Amino acid sequence: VRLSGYCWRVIGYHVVVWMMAGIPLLLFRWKPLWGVRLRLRPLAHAETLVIEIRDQLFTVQVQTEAIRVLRYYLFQGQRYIWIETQQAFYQVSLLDHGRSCDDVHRSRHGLSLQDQMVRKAIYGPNVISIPVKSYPQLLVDEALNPYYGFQAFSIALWLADHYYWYALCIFLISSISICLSLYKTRKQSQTLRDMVKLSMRVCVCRPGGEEEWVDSSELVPGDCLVLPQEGGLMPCDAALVAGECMVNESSLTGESIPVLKTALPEGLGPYCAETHRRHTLFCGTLILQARAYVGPHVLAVVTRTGFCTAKGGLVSSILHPKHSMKFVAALSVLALLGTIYSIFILYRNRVPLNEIVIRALDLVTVVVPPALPAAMTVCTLYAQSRLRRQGIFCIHPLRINLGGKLQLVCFDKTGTLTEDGLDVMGVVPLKGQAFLPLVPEPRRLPVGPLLRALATCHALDPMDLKMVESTGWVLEVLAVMRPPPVPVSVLHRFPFSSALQRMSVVVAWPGQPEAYVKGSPELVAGLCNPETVPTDFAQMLQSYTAAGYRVVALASKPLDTVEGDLSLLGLLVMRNLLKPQTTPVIQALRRTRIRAVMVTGDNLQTAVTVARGCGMVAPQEHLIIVHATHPERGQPASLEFLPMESSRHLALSGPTFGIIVKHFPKLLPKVLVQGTVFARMAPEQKTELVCELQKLQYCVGMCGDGANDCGALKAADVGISLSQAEASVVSPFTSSMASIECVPMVIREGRCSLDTSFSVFKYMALYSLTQFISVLILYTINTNLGDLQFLAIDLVITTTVAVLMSRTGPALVLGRVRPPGALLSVPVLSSLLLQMVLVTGVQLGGYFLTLAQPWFVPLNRTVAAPDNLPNYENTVVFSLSSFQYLILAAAVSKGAPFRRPLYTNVPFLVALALLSSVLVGLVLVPGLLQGPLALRNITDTGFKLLLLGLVTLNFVGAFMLESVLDQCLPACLRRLRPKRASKKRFKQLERELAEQPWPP
Ligand SMILES: CCCCCCCC(=O)OC[C@H](COP(=O)(O)O[C@@H]1[C@H](O)[C@H](OP(=O)(O)O)[C@H](O)[C@H](OP(=O)(O)O)[C@H]1O)OC(=O)CCCCCCC
Ligand SMILES: CC(C)CCC[C@@H](C)[C@H]1CC[C@H]2[C@@H]3CC=C4C[C@@H](OC(=O)CCC(=O)O)CC[C@]4(C)[C@H]3CC[C@]12C
Ligand SMILES: CC(C)CCC[C@@H](C)[C@H]1CC[C@H]2[C@@H]3CC=C4C[C@@H](OC(=O)CCC(=O)O)CC[C@]4(C)[C@H]3CC[C@]12C
Ligand SMILES: CC(C)CCC[C@@H](C)[C@H]1CC[C@H]2[C@@H]3CC=C4C[C@@H](OC(=O)CCC(=O)O)CC[C@]4(C)[C@H]3CC[C@]12C
Ligand SMILES: CCCCCCCCCCCCO[C@@H]1O[C@H](CO)[C@@H](O[C@H]2O[C@H](CO)[C@@H](O)[C@H](O)[C@H]2O)[C@H](O)[C@H]1O
Ligand SMILES: CC(C)CCC[C@@H](C)[C@H]1CC[C@H]2[C@@H]3CC=C4C[C@@H](O)CC[C@]4(C)[C@H]3CC[C@]12C
Ligand SMILES: CC(C)CCC[C@@H](C)[C@H]1CC[C@H]2[C@@H]3CC=C4C[C@@H](O)CC[C@]4(C)[C@H]3CC[C@]12C
Ligand SMILES: CC(C)CCC[C@@H](C)[C@H]1CC[C@H]2[C@@H]3CC=C4C[C@@H](O)CC[C@]4(C)[C@H]3CC[C@]12C
Ligand SMILES: CC(C)CCC[C@@H](C)[C@H]1CC[C@H]2[C@@H]3CC=C4C[C@@H](O)CC[C@]4(C)[C@H]3CC[C@]12C
Ligand SMILES: *[C@@H]1O[C@H](CO)[C@@H](O)[C@H](O)[C@H]1NC(C)=O
Ligand SMILES: CCCCCCCCCCCCCC
Ligand SMILES: [NH3+]CCC[NH2+]CCCC[NH2+]CCC[NH3+]
Ligand SMILES: CCCCCCCCCCCC
Ligand SMILES: CCCCCCCCCC
Ligand SMILES: CCCCCCCCCC
Ligand SMILES: CCCCCCCCCC
Ligand SMILES: CCCCCCCCCC
Ligand SMILES: CCCCCCCCCC
Ligand SMILES: CCCCCCCCCC
Ligand SMILES: CCCCCCCCCC
Ligand SMILES: CCCCCCCCCC
Ligand code: BEF
Ligand SMILES: [Mg+2]
């Protein structure tokens, strides 16, 4: 957390940095401080560049501006300013901490223009600027990968060794990949910048009157907005100081229900907005309307701006957040050994120094394939095209591999698991003091008062629209309804009073005038006569509200004068229905041991009811709600466990999650291990939960749809967006169709990308290593393959097999078993080692067998490697190795259970057959392609048949070796060291809870 400030030397550093030619790696290595120490020229008060460790290192420039002196710097989107009173930097977001509500009210009048200028210079513009970088900036930042440097070095060596064609191919691949990467990264950054941009004309009063109009960018905390009478997005965070408003906070909570925000209660005591959330207007939330009732207009004082806002925090978290495939020790040591052996034998076989250097360096490129990442990404490109053919669109194909090893999925409730809106579940008529049975659809009912009220009473508001749609009375005196009977026209109406949640309408028909009142249950029931209102109004209503539903009371009277003498006609119940495809998908995931979690901004009751309905909680499984009371400061916070109607499941609330994180760090892992519902979660709390679960060694994905769950999608390993706007920006994946079915197929696709990649990896390793071995053999006798032979091994065979072995698709089903995750696993290493023992055996045996012939004559070693050809050793070794490459490519690839069977991809098998056909033609057919490829045309037929038999033996041996390894290695692994006790943190916690269940 500590920091320091570093006050000619740049010229020396630039020369030294450029002269070293490798110090950039050392600077980019563990020790970068020296690189900054020399350049920065190492007080806090007097500095021009600051460095801070987060205990980690980060460097920032101490920006400055003139107002009468200011020194400030940005970090993670948060501004800090230097203060001379304490001679130190302070975060601007805490400049006015714990303002009293009366102090806020004292700013009822706006902010003076001079004070506006100085305060803008302090806080800065109200915009959230995304620092989009230029193309060279992106190149130096996100394309400094050392593999690209190695590829460039290998290319340069190959042009220095006359191997032009493959070097050109690798250069084209790397350049195109780099260009596409930079382009898409820039496009993503630009789109994010567009998404967060906001522009409005906002009114601000002044103490000199004449309330001016300014841009959203000019607002600073302390002036007050005159909220528009109609509505619109909120430019920043603010506190209502005069009037009431109805807001649509779907951006924070994910629900579109109107929310009432009243004025701030004037008085002493600090204003925090954690407890005054009901009196604060947040940035981005849409204002449905603003009614003053006092004074000329609604006034709301600004409190936060820019990154300080909730949207600011979310975007800041978004901006500021296999792996074992890059093992280093074995390859480095092997390359070193092979190199020193090459120099030893080469100096034993006298050849020029430059040739020795070129050969020894080229052996390194033989060892490490420069085409490996392209081979890795071919299958991900296949998977991306496959997904895009069925809706899901991806931006980072290499991310698809993470889908294979996914084991935990979080789901938003509204819009994702349930419809993005409420729907009529049914109406509950009551004749006397007893409710009649719930009616599924209100259309089939008599023409009594209840149906008339169901058809007429409305403000015509998605809710009334759904009501009118369900009742079916088509519109055609403020209206005339047609029953699909009698025509009921609306004779008079009244506005829906925001304070008293009533809406009354008086109607009449050709057949007395009658009033119908729609409102909240308890208040309207209180308006009604207790004679008709039943005894059990509290329980018939708690049965629905506790079950996540929202009830509305209908009252009536045959005609304040209107909503007086009333009798209840029924109750209309609304419900957020599960989408038709969520239960099958959820149960499909559950039967494969992929844990599903709900992370909602809704209340807990709706969350738990939906969780039970969709199958996340089986009917026989327990469920417990953990509640954490806030610390009173006399006694600490303490947890209380509440069971419900009755694998254990825990339903955690929103504030209680933060309480457990802050005051119970030790028990948080236990709760996270077996927690399934997280309700009333803030947009940052979703990201926090995702981060903690990832800290528990999980591979978490999320399928959010709304704006609130955008940071979580960015933080998740595999994020999926069901909305084509406001959330596709951050999500790696986006599905045009909006339901949970996108989740499983992606997982299936991911497994292919995680499985095929493994096979591809193995082949590449083998391709390199066997080639290395062959080179060594020839290097042992002052000979080399040949340029055309090298191209015919590197260009055609590798590219053909690598691309054609990636065509295979998934197996149409989700098994309970994940594919292997770590490339350095025992099975991978054992398979590679055994295959190479076989390959080395065949090559050395062939070499030692071809020497015992009457017709063999050794090459003369007085001549260089390429001028020794055509040559017996070269042709024999090339003939064996060329078949070996195809054998390895065929044996390495797999089929079920993660991919389709290996015999489906007819193109791959046909390619193998054709390549083997041309190779056997080269071995047998004399002098047809042996001009280009310097082969010596073995004349003895028996030896050629023996070579064919030997390579056939290698073929069958390799396939049988792979089969027996796959079908008998798990048994050996289990029988050795049976105390497995898997090292993953969540598995360890699961076992610990299994022995001793934490909730007693
Ligand atoms: C020289 C370098 C060699 C590297 C060796 C590789 C490392 C090594 O040993 O794996 C541990 C193995 C098993 O390791 P291995 O099976 O290869 O992989 C492990 C488990 O499979 C674990 O399984 P779960 O219970 O399902 O988690 C989990 O999946 C992790 O793999 P993941 O990437 O798929 O998540 C690993 O923790 O444990 C023994 O089976 C005893 C025999 C070990 C013999 C040790 C001799 C060295
Ligand atoms: C693996 C090895 C061979 C690395 C090869 C890297 C190349 C792919 C780099 C080297 C120089 C780069 C170019 C350097 C400069 C520009 C100028 C740039 O145009 C501008 O000058 C404006 C850029 C801006 O304002 O952001 C467009 C990209 C381009 C062609 C770059 C594209 C990518 C190039 C060709
Ligand atoms: C000459 C050297 C440098 C080798 C270059 C090999 C390329 C010619 C390969 C590499 C990536 C391949 C592509 C990888 C993925 C696909 C997706 C694939 O899409 C599907 O067939 C599935 C979608 C569907 O059918 O639903 C079509 C072929 C294509 C474009 C491949 C065509 C051939 C490409 C361009
Ligand atoms: C000097 C001599 C060695 C000439 C070598 C010419 C190469 C540039 C040719 C030979 C074989 C060709 C490959 C043969 C087959 C394919 C399969 C082809 O497959 C697909 O297009 C996708 C198939 C699918 O998606 O189902 C992609 C190009 C590729 C790798 C070809 C790219 C160009 C290659 C490497
Ligand atoms: C041996 C056979 C050789 C096969 C040759 C033919 C295949 C050539 C494919 C080259 C890869 C092109 O594909 C491009 O690769 C780069 C990195 O590799 C990916 O880049 C990836 O990482 C970068 C960051 O490093 C991310 O910003 C980007 O989102 C992500 O996808 C591009 O998203 C992918 O589109
Ligand atoms: C044994 C002797 C003769 C070999 C000497 C060759 C050296 C210089 C080669 C081998 C591998 C090469 C490096 C591989 C990785 C990196 C990191 C990259 O970000 C910059 C280039 C750089 C630094 C390469 C260039 C130089 C390099 C270090
Ligand atoms: C001169 C000496 C080093 C012999 C030559 C061996 C070189 C080529 C070896 C030694 C260590 C190796 C590097 C070790 C680490 C990584 C990280 C990985 O994510 C990309 C490949 C990369 C960058 C390797 C490429 C090959 C490498 C540079
Ligand atoms: C002719 C010799 C030098 C070989 C050059 C091959 C060229 C044509 C190769 C090199 C890299 C290749 C591209 C690499 C990746 C992609 C992205 C994929 O989503 C569609 C195909 C596409 C766009 C490829 C088209 C063909 C391509 C441009
Ligand atoms: C061209 C001449 C030499 C024939 C060579 C064909 C070889 C390379 C290929 C073509 C068809 C392939 C087989 C196709 C079907 C199956 C069943 C399945 O479990 C995968 C392996 C297996 C058993 C394959 C093994 C390798 C195979 C035999
Ligand atoms: C190998 O070297 C020479 C030329 O370098 C070549 O002509 C001849 O075949 C071989 N030398 C002998 C003595 O056979
Ligand atoms: C199976 C791979 C066969 C490779 C064929 C090589 C053909 C080279 C063309 C001829 C170039 C040299 C003629 C002077
Ligand atoms: N797989 C990368 C190895 C490439 N080896 C190519 C060696 C080319 C030899 N050229 C010798 C030039 C003789 N005039
Ligand atoms: C683009 C792939 C290379 C094809 C052209 C080169 C053919 C080999 C020429 C060998 C000359 C000795
Ligand atoms: C951290 C990535 C770079 C590691 C390179 C290892 C040293 C190579 C020889 C200098
Ligand atoms: C010839 C190099 C360009 C190949 C096409 C690049 C990507 C096209 C995306 C539609
Ligand atoms: C320099 C060749 C550029 C090819 C990629 C341009 C983008 C294609 C549309 C995504
Ligand atoms: C070299 C031309 C042949 C490439 C294969 C064509 C596609 C067949 C599988 C659909
Ligand atoms: C040359 C390798 C490709 C051959 C493909 C044959 C067509 C298969 C689809 C029926
Ligand atoms: C001794 C004559 C050669 C014997 C060859 C036996 C192997 C035939 C399988 C191709
Ligand atoms: C896939 C390796 C194929 C080896 C073929 C063996 C020769 C058979 C024809 C005599
Ligand atoms: C289940 C299919 C098993 C395939 C193994 C490979 C057989 C090779 C015969 C030579
Ligand atoms: F719409 Be979710 F419940 F945040
Ligand atoms: Mg939602």
Handedness of CA 760, 762, 768, 773 (dihedral sign): negative
**CB 918 near ligand 11, within 6 Å:** yes
- 861 Cα to the center of ligand 10, angstroms: 8
Dig out the tokens for 865 from the structure. Answer: 């490697």
Question: Binding site annotation covers 536?
Answer: no
Question: Is residue 373 domain-resident?
Answer: yes
Dig out the tokens for 892 from the structure. Answer: 């390495």
The SS3 assignment for 677 reads strand
- 869 Cα to the center of ligand 10, angstroms: 12
- 658 Cα to the center of ligand 13, angstroms: 66
**CB 146 near ligand 14, within 6 Å:** yes
Number of domains in the chain: 6
For strands 286-291 and 232-233, give the pairing: antiparallel
Q: Are residues 641 and 774 in the same domain?
A: no
- 680 φ, ψ (degrees, to nearest 5): 55, 40
CA angle 55, 142, 366 (to 5 degrees): 110
Rg (CA), the chain: 37
Mutate to test the pocket of ligand 8, among 172, 177, 799, 803 (most ligand atoms within 8 A of CB): 172
Dig out the tokens for 370 from the structure. Answer: 């420069």
**CB 163 near ligand 12, within 6 Å:** yes
Amino acid letter, residue 320: H
Question: Is residue 413 domain-resident?
Answer: yes
- CA 381 to CA 633: how far, in whole Å? 57
Residues 6 or more apart in contact with residue 177 via CB below 8 angstroms: 373, 374, 377
Question: Is residue 402 domain-resident?
Answer: no
Residue nearest to atom 13 of ligand 2 (CA): 136
- CA 259 to CA 281: how far, in whole Å? 11
Question: Is residue 124 domain-resident?
Answer: no
Mutate to test the pocket of ligand 16, among 177, 179, 185 (most ligand atoms within 8 A of CB): 179
Q: Are residues 183 and 211 in the same domain?
A: no
- 129 Cα to the center of ligand 22, angstroms: 27
Q: Are residues 566 and 588 in the same domain?
A: no
Residue nearest to atom 9 of ligand 16 (CA): 180
- 23 Cα to the center of ligand 14, angstroms: 11
Dig out the tokens for 853 from the structure. Answer: 């012939």
Return the ligand number nearest the Cα of 914: 9
Dig out the tokens for 573 from the structure. Answer: 């119940």
Q: Are residues 207 and 177 in the same domain?
A: no
Q: Are residues 58 and 162 in the same domain?
A: no
Return the ligand number nearest the Cα of 920: 20
Tally: H helices and E strands in the chain: 30, 35
Q: Are residues 189 and 229 in the same domain?
A: no
Q: Are residues 179 and 283 in the same domain?
A: no
CA angle 205, 206, 208 (to 5 degrees): 135
- 911 Cα to the center of ligand 17, angstroms: 10
Ligand 6 pocket, Cβ-based, cut-off 6 angstroms: 22, 25, 146, 149-150, 153
Tell me the CATH number at 647: 3.40.50.1000
- CA 435 to CA 595: how far, in whole Å? 41
Residue nearest to atom 12 of ligand 10 (CA): 860
Question: Binding site annotation covers 867?
Answer: no
Residue nearest to atom 30 of ligand 4 (CA): 800
**CB 863 near ligand 10, within 6 Å:** yes
- CA 728 to CA 736: how far, in whole Å? 10
For strands 480-482 and 488-493, give the pairing: antiparallel
Q: Are residues 570 and 597 in the same domain?
A: no
Q: Whose structure tokens read 């300013």?
A: 81
In terms of residue numbers, what domain contains 829? 369-392+757-975
- 57 φ, ψ (degrees, to nearest 5): -75, 140
Q: Are residues 703 and 583 in the same domain?
A: yes
Q: Are residues 433 and 531 in the same domain?
A: yes
Q: Are 274 and 268 in contact (CB under 8 A)?
A: no
The ligand 12 atom nearest the CA atom of 369? 1
Q: Are residues 374 and 452 in the same domain?
A: no
- 971 Cα to the center of ligand 1, angstroms: 14
CA angle 833, 834, 837 (to 5 degrees): 85
- 332 Cα to the center of ligand 7, angstroms: 7
**CB 828 near ligand 8, within 6 Å:** no
Q: Are 592 and 432 in contact (CB under 8 A)?
A: no
| Active-site annotation holder among 223, 362, 412, 717 | 412
Question: Is residue 982 domain-resident?
Answer: no
**CB 800 near ligand 4, within 6 Å:** yes
Which of 516, 544, 575 terminates a domain? The answer is 575
Residue nearest to atom 17 of ligand 6 (CA): 146
Instruction: List residues, by chain if needed, whose CB lies under 5 Å from ion ligand 23.
Output: 254, 412, 414-415, 705-706
Method by which this entry was solved: cryo-EM
Tell me the CATH number at 904: 1.20.1110.10
**CB 183 near ligand 16, within 6 Å:** yes
Residue nearest to atom 3 of ligand 20 (CA): 916
Dig out the tokens for 67 from the structure. Answer: 């107002």
The SS3 assignment for 829 reads helix
Beta bridge partners of 426: 573
Q: Are 456 and 505 in contact (CB under 8 A)?
A: yes
Which of 63, 95, 127 terminates a domain? The answer is 95
Residues 6 or more apart in contact with residue 714 via CB below 8 angstroms: 317, 318, 321, 687, 730, 731
Q: Are residues 781 and 887 in the same domain?
A: yes
- CA 252 to CA 255: how far, in whole Å? 8
DSSP single-letter state for residue 793:
I
Q: What is the separation, in whole angstroms, between the first and last Cα of the chain?
A: 40
Tell me the CATH number at 532: 3.40.1110
Which of 60, 95, 130 terminates a domain? The answer is 95
Ligand 19 pocket, Cβ-based, cut-off 6 angstroms: 942, 945-946, 948-949, 952
**CB 173 near ligand 8, within 6 Å:** yes
- CA 865 to CA 309: how far, in whole Å? 70
Question: Is residue 40 domain-resident?
Answer: yes
**CB 820 near ligand 12, within 6 Å:** no
Amino acid letter, residue 882: S
Q: For the sheet containing 244-248, what is the strand order?
A: 232-233, 286-291, 244-248, 259-261
Residue nearest to atom 7 of ligand 16 (CA): 180
Return the ligand number nearest the Cα of 712: 22
Return the ligand number nearest the Cα of 951: 20
- 799 Cα to the center of ligand 14, angstroms: 28
Q: Whose structure tokens read 């394309």?
A: 143
Q: Is position 412 annotated as part of the catalytic site?
A: yes
Question: Is residue 134 domain-resident?
Answer: no
Q: Whose structure tokens read 């050996």?
A: 972
- 450 φ, ψ (degrees, to nearest 5): -65, -45
CA angle 827, 955, 926 (to 5 degrees): 145
Dig out the tokens for 178 from the structure. Answer: 């780099």
Dig out the tokens for 236 from the structure. Answer: 């920043």
Helix axes 164-196, 310-319, angle to 10 degrees: 170
For strands 718-721 and 733-734, give the pairing: parallel
Question: Is residue 113 domain-resident?
Answer: no
CA angle 354, 360, 361 (to 5 degrees): 90
**CB 540 near ligand 4, within 6 Å:** no
Tell me the CATH number at 303: 2.70.150.10
Within 13 A of 761's CA, how many CA atoms are on the CB side?
A: 21
